[PDB]
From Swiss-Prot, chain A:
Component of the heterotetrameric kinetochore subcomplex COMA, which consists of AME1, CTF19, MCM21 and OKP1. The COMA subcomplex is part of a larger constitutive centromere-associated network (CCAN) (also known as central kinetochore CTF19 complex in yeast), which is composed of at least AME1, CHL4, CNN1, CTF3, CTF19, IML3, MCM16, MCM21, MCM22, MHF1, MHF2, MIF2, NKP1, NKP2, OKP1 and WIP1. COMA binds the centromeric nucleosome-binding protein MIF2, and to the outer kinetochore MIND subcomplex. CTF19 interacts with the CTF3 complex subunits CTF3, MCM16 and MCM22 as well as CHL4 and IML3. It is found in: Nucleus; Chromosome, Centromere, Kinetochore. Component of the kinetochore, a multiprotein complex that assembles on centromeric DNA and attaches chromosomes to spindle microtubules, mediating chromosome segregation and sister chromatid segregation during meiosis and mitosis. Component of the inner kinetochore COMA complex, which connects centromere-associated proteins and the outer kinetochore. COMA interacts with other inner kinetochore proteins to form the inner kinetochore constitutive centromere-associated network (CCAN), which serves as a structural platform for outer kinetochore assembly. This is Inner kinetochore subunit CTF19.
UniProtKB/Swiss-Prot annotation, chain B:
This is Inner kinetochore subunit OKP1. The chain holds residues 357 to 391 of 406 of the full protein. The gene is OKP1. Belongs to the CENP-Q/OKP1 family. Component of the kinetochore, a multiprotein complex that assembles on centromeric DNA and attaches chromosomes to spindle microtubules, mediating chromosome segregation and sister chromatid segregation during meiosis and mitosis. Component of the inner kinetochore COMA complex, which connects centromere-associated proteins and the outer kinetochore. COMA interacts with other inner kinetochore proteins to form the inner kinetochore constitutive centromere-associated network (CCAN), which serves as a structural platform for outer kinetochore assembly. It comes from Saccharomyces cerevisiae (strain ATCC 204508 / S288c). Present with 2688 molecules/cell in log phase SD medium. Residues 1-35 are annotated as: Interaction with NKP1-NKP2.
UniProtKB/Swiss-Prot annotation, chain C:
It is found in: Nucleus; Chromosome, Centromere, Kinetochore. Present with 606 molecules/cell in log phase SD medium. Signal peptide: none annotated. This is Inner kinetochore subunit CHL4. It comes from Saccharomyces cerevisiae (strain ATCC 204508 / S288c) (Baker's yeast).
UniProtKB/Swiss-Prot annotation, chain E:
This is Inner kinetochore subunit NKP2. Residues 1-26 form a coiled coil. One of its GO terms (cellular component) is Mis6-Sim4 complex. Keywords: Cell cycle, Cell division, Centromere, Chromosome, Coiled coil, Kinetochore, Meiosis, Mitosis, Nucleus. GO terms for biological process: attachment of spindle microtubules to kinetochore; cell division; chromosome segregation; meiotic cell cycle. Belongs to the NKP2 family. It comes from the Eukaryota. It comes from Saccharomyces cerevisiae (strain ATCC 204508 / S288c). Component of the inner kinetochore constitutive centromere-associated network (CCAN) (also known as central kinetochore CTF19 complex in yeast), which is composed of at least AME1, CHL4, CNN1, CTF3, CTF19, IML3, MCM16, MCM21, MCM22, MHF1, MHF2, MIF2, NKP1, NKP2, OKP1 and WIP1. NKP1 interacts directly with OKP1 and AME1. It is found in: Nucleus; Chromosome, Centromere, Kinetochore. The gene is NKP2. The keyword Disulfide bond does not apply. Component of the kinetochore, a multiprotein complex that assembles on centromeric DNA and attaches chromosomes to spindle microtubules, mediating chromosome segregation and sister chromatid segregation during meiosis and mitosis. Component of the inner kinetochore constitutive centromere-associated network (CCAN), which serves as a structural platform for outer kinetochore assembly.
């Protein structure tokens, strides 16, 4: 029996048809891992992934809400410009910073390589 | 290192200026009465 | 004074050198002749440009390599080849024919037990090695970098002492000992030799690498493997080390792309085509099965043994052929340790096992990880489901 | 931060004017709190104002 | 010479700190008015919270 | 001797004071901007 499995496949149905070493495609399970285990207490949110298909450039805006200190959590909002093929980050800019982390993030975000910025903010 | 004593006196002057600025600001007086 | 310089001539048999240069192509012979006459010179009289023009006339004459071999062994250097020549021709044979040499890996452990990532200053390392080995034997060492691989291969040649044997005044050579240094890796590849001279060379190498804290070489494998490219794929500082067999997909990263990429071509959206594997014992019970699901079970065996659906690219040939592996599987069936010793032999163990799995002789749903090519070229004991290698 | 938040930079003048702005800000906040106390003096409004002041001051 | 270049870097940093120190020295004596306003505001806020 | 501190060969009270002073007059969070936030909250609650 030939079966097609996608990102919305059941976990039991995936374990029925598992004979490779690739990671599990159950995307709810993948995001459950990503939310609960590697980065807990972080309410990420994406709200606009609009694109300029003439240039082949994707515009992404995400909100990172570091809610480990639930009384006064500090949140940030990025804007990324993809290349959507031959993936190059042409430009990224910081749309909004919460004022209670604004100075430390202002000193940190002045440098490039925003992956370090996100990891440093979470740490 | 002759410049260590220079930093000692410079940091003493800077700390004195910052301390008198903080005392003029009265942050500790308004902090306790706001909680 | 016991160190051997790059201008001494040893006693080498002319016929052995004659048959040794036969295997080299004409263009490396040309490059060697110009480099040798530019550095050391020869008995032939002429300008360097004049000799370049003479070899040019030889190469647009289309002459066979035999004539130029007789020339460079009979008029250019009739008395005998210098040690640098004898080392460089054999290193060029190593470059031309890498499959004719077998290597043995050895980790560079140090101090507490953390491996030492060996880094070489090549000229100073050669000078220090030659001065260290000069105290014991008549040593000449030659070092070069691979044109393709990121290694530093040395060649250590040791010379001994010498009815009435008339007179030779010789210095008889032995078989050279090769030690390959990868750029940044604790694993050290050396030639297969267990006599006292090989131990001396490895000992002097360990003493002359260190210079800060004492370093010991512990052998991580006792079965030699051919083809230096393969031993860099296995034990060298690459991604394919510690990800082999069914896990070569992680070492090649052909299944995931960057997070900055198109999300319409993601694996979870397009999906992949698989088959329901029967967990009930039905392999032993069972003809002209459908050619689409036959392709899927062939792909299943291909995935299990090479990691990729299309493989790392007849088609059974793995990324690294393995000659000898021996696994000692141990289980605990009701408080009894039950050992099974599986030994293997051939030109490519896991390719042959893949072919046997394709012929429905071995169940691909029950073939374990270590049999499938995981932690390849390592022979060890499987206790509690965990493979620990032998020593 | 002061340089990009002023646009008239004169950063030495930021501190005396900081003290003056603090004085006028406290007297203005005094005026607003007196107006809020005299205007309603209710139960829900006073509790909401106290909670807002405590939340904005402590955190 | 290593300590010389270390002391030169330290001296440059002290010059920067002294530049900042002249930049912040603002003479004032207005703390009494701020303290009185804070005391009055605290008393009125306590009176409002008491109701 | 043992209970003495006259040469600042290693001191970190100054960096603590620098951090406190910077946190005090921050143009974004600071002390004056907290007072302004209290002002806007009181204005929204009253008017």
């Amino acid at each position: 029996r030939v079966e097609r499995i996608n990102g919305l496949t059941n976990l039991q149905k995936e374990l029925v048809t598992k004979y490779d070493t690739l990671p599990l495609l159950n995307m709810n399970l993948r995001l459950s891992y990503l939310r609960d285990h590697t980065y807990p207490h972080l309410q990420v949110s994406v709200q606009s992934r609009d694109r300029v298909h003439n240039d082949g450039i994707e515009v992404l805006v995400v909100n990172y809400k570091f809610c480990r200190n639930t009384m006064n959590p500090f949140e940030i909002q990025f804007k990324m410009f993809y290349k959507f093929e031959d993936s190059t980050l042409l430009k990224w800019e910081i749309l909004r910073i919460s004022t209670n982390v604004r100075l430390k993030a202002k000193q940190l975000l002045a440098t490039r390589n925003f992956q370090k910025c996100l990891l440093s903010l979470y740490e | 290192l002759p410049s260590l004593k220079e930093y000692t006196k410079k940091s003493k002057e800077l700390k004195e200026t910052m301390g008198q600025m903080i005392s003029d600001s009265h942050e500790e007086e308004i902090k306790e009465v706001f909680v | 004074e016991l160190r051997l310089e790059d201008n001494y001539v040893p006693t080498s048999d002319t016929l052995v050198v004659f048959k040794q240069l036969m295997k080299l192509p004409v263009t490396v012979l040309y490059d060697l002749t110009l480099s040798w006459f530019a550095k050391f010179g020869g008995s032939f009289d002429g300008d360097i440009y004049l000799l370049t023009e003479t070899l040019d006339l030889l190469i647009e004459k289309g002459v066979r390599r035999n004539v130029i071999v007789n020339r460079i062994l009979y008029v250019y250097w009739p008395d005998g080849l210098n040690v640098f020549q004898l080392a460089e021709i054999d290193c060029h044979l190593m470059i031309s024919k890498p499959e004719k040499f077998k290597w043995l890996p050895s980790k560079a452990l140090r101090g507490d037990g953390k491996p030492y990532v060996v880094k070489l200053q090549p000229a100073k390392f050669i000078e220090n090695l030659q001065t260290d080995l000069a105290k014991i034997y008549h040593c000449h060492v030659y070092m070069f970098k691979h044109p393709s691989l990121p290694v530093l291969i040395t060649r250590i040649q040791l010379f001994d002492s010498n009815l009435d044997k008339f007179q030779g005044k010789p210095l008889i050579s032995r078989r050279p000992y090769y030690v390959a240094f990868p750029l940044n890796s604790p694993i050290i590849f050396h030639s297969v030799d267990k006599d006292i001279y090989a131990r001396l060379v490895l000992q002097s190498i360990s003493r002359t690498i260190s210079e800060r804290e004492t370093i010991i070489f512990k052998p991580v494998q006792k079965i030699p493997v051919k083809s230096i490219h393969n031993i860099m794929t296995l034990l060298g500082p690459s991604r394919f080390a510690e990800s082999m067999g069914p896990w070569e997909c992680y070492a090649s990263a052909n299944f995931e792309r960057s997070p900055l990429h198109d999300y319409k071509k993601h694996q979870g959206l397009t999906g992949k085509k698989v088959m329901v594997r029967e967990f009930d014992d039905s392999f032993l019970n069972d003809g002209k099965e459908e050619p689409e699901i036959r392709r899927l079970r062939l792909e299943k065996n291909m995935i299990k043994f090479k990691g990729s659906a299309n493989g790392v690219m007849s088609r059974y040939s793995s990324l690294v052929p393995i000659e000898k592996v021996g696994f000692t599987l141990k289980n605990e069936i009701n408080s009894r340790i039950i050992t099974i010793k599986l030994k293997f032999n051939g030109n490519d163990i896991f390719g042959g096992l893949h072919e046997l799995c394709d012929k429905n002789l071995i169940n691909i749903d029950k073939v374990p990880g270590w049999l499938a090519g995981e932690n390849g070229s390592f022979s060890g004991t499987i206790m509690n489901g965990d493979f620990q290698r032998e020593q | 931060s002061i340089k990009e938040a002023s646009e008239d930079d004169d950063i030495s003048e930021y501190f005396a004017t900081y003290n003056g702005k603090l004085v006028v800000a406290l007297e203005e906040m005094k005026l607003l709190l007196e107006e809020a106390v005299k205007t309603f003096g209710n139960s829900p409004e006073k509790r909401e104002k106290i909670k807002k002041i405590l939340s904005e001051l402590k955190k | 010479q290593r300590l010389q270049i270390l002391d030169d870097a330290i001296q440059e940093k002290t010059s920067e700190l002294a530049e900042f120190e002249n930049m912040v020295r603002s003479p004032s004596a207005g703390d009494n008015a701020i303290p009185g306003l804070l005391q009055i505001i605290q008393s009125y806020i306590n009176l409002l919270e008491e109701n | 001797s043992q209970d003495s501190e006259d040469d600042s060969i290693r001191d970190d009270s100054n960096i603590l004071d620098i951090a406190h002073f910077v946190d005090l007059m921050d143009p974004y969070n600071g002390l004056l901007k907290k007072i302004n936030k209290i002002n806007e909250n009181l204005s929204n609650e009253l008017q």
